[PDB]
Amino acid sequence: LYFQSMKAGIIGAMEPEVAILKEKLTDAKSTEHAGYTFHQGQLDGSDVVIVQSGIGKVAAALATAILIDRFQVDYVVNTGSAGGFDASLKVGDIVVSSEVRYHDVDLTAFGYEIGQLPANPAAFMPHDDLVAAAKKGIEQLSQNIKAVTGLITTGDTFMTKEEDVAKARANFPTMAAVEMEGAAIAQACLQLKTPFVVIRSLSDIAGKESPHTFEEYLETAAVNSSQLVLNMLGQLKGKVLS
Ligand SMILES: Nc1ncnc2[nH]cnc12
């Protein structure tokens, strides 16, 4: 009958990235702390807390901290949209983080790696089992989408200027996709000894077409990322993280 499951923290920067899972919430309760709105409930039996963070590093990191400190989630899933870097991937595809780095952190002047904050690893690491879970989570099939593991990077600039995309690409050649909150969530999670995984779907190919492509395909990327979350929640049912 009843599964014994962890409590999942689920975070998205904007309302569409979160609206779907917010809906399928059962026994919904919504609470407010420190300027954020947290939606506690269940998804197919599993206990979750869903928060829309706002855009950018600091906002995502603060929501994450409250998510962990106030609601004691066992792990954090960051979901949402991202700009594709990997040419193999096309709008709607999904990238599960295999690692996450900031692209807009630079303390190389002092010997740190590009993207790396002092007293932090160069790359934040998602839990293997959360990664493994979403890997199996690709029984995807709605009723076709590609889904991959790859490097995801994070900065506080929306990545549109051919020059910005080039510099990022040069520093982080293996990058599958880019967004504005992933590494910040991971940074907060590390600080709070909490497992994370970042799941993001391509709302655009990063570059000249990005602003209107993003607006066109945000709802698609929300649908696809939200689905892989639900599956991943299924794979984690009755399990605990190693
Ligand atoms: N091109 C882009 N840059 C940063 N974040 C994004 N999220 C979706 N598309 C993006």
CSV table of C-alpha atoms and ligand atoms in Angstrom, one decimal:
chain,number,residue,atom,x,y,z
A,1,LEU,CA,0.0,0.0,0.0
A,2,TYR,CA,1.6,3.2,1.3
A,3,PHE,CA,5.2,4.0,0.1
A,4,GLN,CA,7.8,5.4,2.5
A,5,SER,CA,9.1,8.4,0.6
A,6,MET,CA,11.4,11.4,1.0
A,7,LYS,CA,10.2,15.0,0.9
A,8,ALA,CA,11.1,16.7,-2.3
A,9,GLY,CA,11.9,20.4,-2.7
A,10,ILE,CA,10.8,21.6,-6.1
A,11,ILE,CA,12.0,24.9,-7.4
A,12,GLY,CA,11.3,26.9,-10.6
A,13,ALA,CA,12.1,30.6,-11.3
A,14,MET,CA,8.8,31.6,-12.9
A,15,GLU,CA,5.1,30.6,-12.6
A,16,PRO,CA,4.8,28.5,-15.8
A,17,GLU,CA,7.8,26.4,-14.8
A,18,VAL,CA,5.9,25.5,-11.7
A,19,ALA,CA,2.1,25.8,-12.5
A,20,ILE,CA,1.7,22.3,-13.7
A,21,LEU,CA,3.0,20.4,-10.7
A,22,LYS,CA,1.3,23.0,-8.5
A,23,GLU,CA,-2.0,21.9,-10.0
A,24,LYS,CA,-1.6,18.1,-9.6
A,25,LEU,CA,-0.9,18.8,-5.9
A,26,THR,CA,-3.2,16.9,-3.6
A,27,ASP,CA,-3.9,18.1,0.0
A,28,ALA,CA,-2.6,21.5,-1.1
A,29,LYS,CA,-1.6,24.0,1.5
A,30,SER,CA,0.1,27.2,0.7
A,31,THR,CA,2.2,29.2,3.2
A,32,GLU,CA,4.4,32.3,3.0
A,33,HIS,CA,7.8,32.9,4.6
A,34,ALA,CA,10.4,35.5,3.9
A,35,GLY,CA,8.6,36.9,0.8
A,36,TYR,CA,8.1,33.6,-1.0
A,37,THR,CA,5.1,31.4,-1.4
A,38,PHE,CA,5.5,27.7,-0.6
A,39,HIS,CA,3.0,25.2,-1.9
A,40,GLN,CA,3.1,22.0,0.3
A,41,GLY,CA,1.1,19.0,-0.9
A,42,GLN,CA,1.5,15.6,-2.5
A,43,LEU,CA,2.2,14.4,-6.1
A,44,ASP,CA,1.1,10.8,-6.7
A,45,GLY,CA,1.6,10.1,-3.0
A,46,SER,CA,5.1,11.7,-2.6
A,47,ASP,CA,5.4,14.7,-0.2
A,48,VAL,CA,6.6,17.8,-2.1
A,49,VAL,CA,7.2,21.5,-1.4
A,50,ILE,CA,7.0,23.7,-4.6
A,51,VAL,CA,8.3,27.2,-4.8
A,52,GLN,CA,8.5,29.8,-7.5
A,53,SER,CA,11.8,31.6,-6.8
A,54,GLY,CA,12.2,34.5,-9.2
A,55,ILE,CA,14.9,35.0,-11.7
A,56,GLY,CA,18.6,34.8,-11.0
A,57,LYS,CA,21.2,33.5,-8.6
A,58,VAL,CA,20.4,35.2,-5.3
A,59,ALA,CA,16.7,34.7,-5.6
A,60,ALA,CA,17.0,31.0,-6.4
A,61,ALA,CA,19.5,30.6,-3.6
A,62,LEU,CA,17.3,32.2,-1.0
A,63,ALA,CA,14.2,30.2,-1.9
A,64,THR,CA,16.4,27.0,-1.7
A,65,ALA,CA,17.7,27.9,1.8
A,66,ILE,CA,14.2,28.5,3.1
A,67,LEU,CA,13.0,25.3,1.4
A,68,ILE,CA,15.6,23.3,3.3
A,69,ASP,CA,15.7,25.2,6.6
A,70,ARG,CA,11.9,25.6,7.0
A,71,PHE,CA,10.6,22.5,5.4
A,72,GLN,CA,13.5,20.2,5.8
A,73,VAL,CA,13.3,18.6,2.3
A,74,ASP,CA,15.6,15.6,1.8
A,75,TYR,CA,16.6,16.9,-1.6
A,76,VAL,CA,16.0,19.7,-4.1
A,77,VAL,CA,14.9,19.4,-7.7
A,78,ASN,CA,15.4,22.5,-9.9
A,79,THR,CA,13.1,22.5,-12.9
A,80,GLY,CA,12.5,24.9,-15.8
A,81,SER,CA,13.7,26.3,-19.1
A,82,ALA,CA,17.2,26.6,-20.5
A,83,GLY,CA,19.0,27.8,-23.7
A,84,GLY,CA,20.6,25.1,-25.7
A,85,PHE,CA,24.3,25.2,-26.4
A,86,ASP,CA,24.7,21.6,-27.6
A,87,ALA,CA,23.8,21.6,-31.3
A,88,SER,CA,22.5,18.0,-31.0
A,89,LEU,CA,19.6,19.3,-29.0
A,90,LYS,CA,16.4,21.0,-30.3
A,91,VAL,CA,13.7,23.0,-28.5
A,92,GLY,CA,11.7,20.8,-26.1
A,93,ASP,CA,14.6,18.5,-25.4
A,94,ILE,CA,15.6,17.9,-21.8
A,95,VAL,CA,18.9,18.2,-20.0
A,96,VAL,CA,19.5,16.5,-16.7
A,97,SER,CA,22.5,18.0,-14.9
A,98,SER,CA,25.5,15.7,-14.7
A,99,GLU,CA,27.4,18.7,-13.2
A,100,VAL,CA,26.6,22.4,-12.8
A,101,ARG,CA,28.8,25.4,-13.0
A,102,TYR,CA,28.5,29.1,-13.0
A,103,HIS,CA,29.7,30.6,-16.3
A,104,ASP,CA,29.8,34.2,-14.9
A,105,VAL,CA,32.0,33.6,-11.9
A,106,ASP,CA,35.6,34.7,-12.5
A,107,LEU,CA,38.4,34.6,-9.8
A,108,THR,CA,41.0,33.2,-12.2
A,109,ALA,CA,43.1,36.2,-11.2
A,110,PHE,CA,43.8,34.3,-8.0
A,111,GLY,CA,44.2,30.8,-9.5
A,112,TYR,CA,40.7,29.5,-9.2
A,113,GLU,CA,39.1,27.7,-12.2
A,114,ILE,CA,36.9,29.6,-14.5
A,115,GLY,CA,33.4,29.6,-13.0
A,116,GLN,CA,34.6,28.6,-9.6
A,117,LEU,CA,34.0,30.4,-6.3
A,118,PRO,CA,36.6,30.2,-3.6
A,119,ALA,CA,35.8,27.6,-0.9
A,120,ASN,CA,33.5,25.9,-3.5
A,121,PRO,CA,34.1,23.2,-6.0
A,122,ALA,CA,34.5,24.2,-9.6
A,123,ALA,CA,31.5,22.1,-10.5
A,124,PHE,CA,28.6,21.3,-8.1
A,125,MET,CA,27.6,17.7,-8.3
A,126,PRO,CA,24.1,16.3,-8.4
A,127,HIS,CA,23.4,13.2,-6.4
A,128,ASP,CA,24.1,10.1,-8.6
A,129,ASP,CA,20.8,8.4,-7.5
A,130,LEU,CA,18.7,11.5,-8.4
A,131,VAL,CA,20.5,11.6,-11.8
A,132,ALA,CA,20.0,7.8,-12.1
A,133,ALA,CA,16.3,8.3,-11.2
A,134,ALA,CA,15.6,10.8,-13.9
A,135,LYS,CA,17.6,8.6,-16.3
A,136,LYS,CA,15.1,5.9,-15.7
A,137,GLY,CA,12.6,8.7,-15.7
A,138,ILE,CA,12.9,8.6,-19.4
A,139,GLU,CA,10.2,6.2,-20.0
A,140,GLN,CA,9.1,9.6,-21.0
A,141,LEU,CA,6.8,9.2,-23.6
A,142,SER,CA,3.9,11.6,-23.7
A,143,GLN,CA,1.5,9.5,-25.8
A,144,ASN,CA,9.6,12.9,-30.0
A,145,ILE,CA,11.6,14.4,-27.1
A,146,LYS,CA,15.4,13.7,-26.6
A,147,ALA,CA,16.7,13.6,-23.1
A,148,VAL,CA,20.3,13.8,-22.0
A,149,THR,CA,22.7,14.3,-19.1
A,150,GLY,CA,25.2,17.0,-19.6
A,151,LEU,CA,26.9,20.1,-18.1
A,152,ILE,CA,24.5,23.0,-17.3
A,153,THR,CA,25.9,26.5,-16.6
A,154,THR,CA,24.3,29.4,-14.8
A,155,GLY,CA,24.6,33.2,-14.9
A,156,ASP,CA,22.6,36.3,-14.2
A,157,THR,CA,22.6,37.4,-17.9
A,158,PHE,CA,20.0,36.1,-20.3
A,159,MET,CA,22.2,34.6,-23.0
A,160,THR,CA,21.4,36.3,-26.3
A,161,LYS,CA,24.4,38.4,-27.6
A,162,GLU,CA,26.4,36.4,-30.0
A,163,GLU,CA,29.5,37.6,-28.1
A,164,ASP,CA,28.2,36.5,-24.7
A,165,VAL,CA,27.3,33.1,-26.0
A,166,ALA,CA,30.8,32.8,-27.6
A,167,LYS,CA,32.7,33.6,-24.4
A,168,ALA,CA,30.6,31.2,-22.4
A,169,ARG,CA,31.1,28.5,-25.0
A,170,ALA,CA,34.8,29.1,-25.0
A,171,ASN,CA,35.1,28.7,-21.3
A,172,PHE,CA,32.7,25.8,-21.1
A,173,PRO,CA,33.0,23.9,-24.4
A,174,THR,CA,31.1,20.8,-23.2
A,175,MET,CA,28.0,22.8,-22.1
A,176,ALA,CA,24.7,21.3,-22.9
A,177,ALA,CA,22.6,24.3,-21.8
A,178,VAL,CA,22.5,27.5,-19.9
A,179,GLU,CA,20.1,29.1,-17.4
A,180,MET,CA,20.0,31.6,-14.5
A,181,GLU,CA,19.4,29.6,-11.3
A,182,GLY,CA,21.0,26.0,-11.4
A,183,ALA,CA,24.4,26.6,-9.9
A,184,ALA,CA,22.9,28.9,-7.2
A,185,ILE,CA,20.5,26.2,-6.0
A,186,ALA,CA,23.4,23.8,-6.1
A,187,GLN,CA,25.6,26.2,-4.2
A,188,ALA,CA,23.0,26.7,-1.5
A,189,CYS,CA,22.4,23.0,-1.3
A,190,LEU,CA,26.0,22.3,-0.8
A,191,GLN,CA,26.2,24.8,2.0
A,192,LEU,CA,23.2,23.1,3.6
A,193,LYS,CA,24.4,19.5,3.0
A,194,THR,CA,21.5,18.7,0.7
A,195,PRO,CA,21.4,16.6,-2.5
A,196,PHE,CA,20.1,18.4,-5.6
A,197,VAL,CA,19.5,17.7,-9.3
A,198,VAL,CA,18.8,20.2,-12.0
A,199,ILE,CA,16.3,19.2,-14.7
A,200,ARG,CA,15.8,21.7,-17.5
A,201,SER,CA,14.1,21.7,-20.9
A,202,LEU,CA,15.2,23.7,-23.9
A,203,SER,CA,13.0,26.8,-24.5
A,204,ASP,CA,15.4,28.2,-27.1
A,205,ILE,CA,18.8,27.8,-28.7
A,206,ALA,CA,21.0,30.4,-27.0
A,207,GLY,CA,21.7,33.3,-29.3
A,208,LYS,CA,19.9,35.9,-31.6
A,209,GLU,CA,16.6,34.1,-31.7
A,210,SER,CA,16.4,33.6,-27.9
A,211,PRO,CA,14.0,36.3,-26.5
A,212,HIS,CA,11.0,35.5,-28.8
A,213,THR,CA,11.8,31.8,-29.1
A,214,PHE,CA,11.9,31.6,-25.2
A,215,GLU,CA,8.5,33.3,-25.0
A,216,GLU,CA,7.1,31.0,-27.7
A,217,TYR,CA,8.4,27.7,-26.1
A,218,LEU,CA,8.5,28.4,-22.4
A,219,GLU,CA,5.2,26.6,-21.9
A,220,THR,CA,6.6,23.6,-23.9
A,221,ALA,CA,9.8,23.5,-21.8
A,222,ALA,CA,7.7,23.7,-18.6
A,223,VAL,CA,5.5,20.8,-19.7
A,224,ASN,CA,8.5,18.6,-20.6
A,225,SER,CA,10.6,19.4,-17.6
A,226,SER,CA,7.6,19.0,-15.3
A,227,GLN,CA,6.8,15.6,-16.7
A,228,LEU,CA,10.4,14.2,-16.1
A,229,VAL,CA,10.0,15.5,-12.6
A,230,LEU,CA,6.8,13.4,-12.0
A,231,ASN,CA,8.5,10.3,-13.4
A,232,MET,CA,11.6,10.9,-11.3
A,233,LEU,CA,9.3,11.2,-8.3
A,234,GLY,CA,7.9,7.8,-9.3
A,235,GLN,CA,11.3,6.2,-9.5
A,236,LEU,CA,12.2,7.5,-6.0
A,237,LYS,CA,9.1,6.2,-4.3
A,238,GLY,CA,10.0,4.0,-1.4
A,239,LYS,CA,13.6,4.8,-1.8
A,240,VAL,CA,16.2,6.9,0.0
A,241,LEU,CA,19.4,8.6,-1.3
A,242,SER,CA,22.7,6.8,-0.9
B,1,LIG,N1,19.2,31.7,-23.5
B,1,LIG,C1,19.0,31.6,-22.1
B,1,LIG,N2,19.9,32.2,-21.3
B,1,LIG,C2,19.7,32.1,-19.9
B,1,LIG,N3,18.7,31.4,-19.4
B,1,LIG,C3,17.7,30.8,-20.1
B,1,LIG,N4,16.6,30.2,-19.9
B,1,LIG,C4,16.0,29.8,-21.1
B,1,LIG,N5,16.8,30.3,-22.1
B,1,LIG,C5,17.8,30.9,-21.6
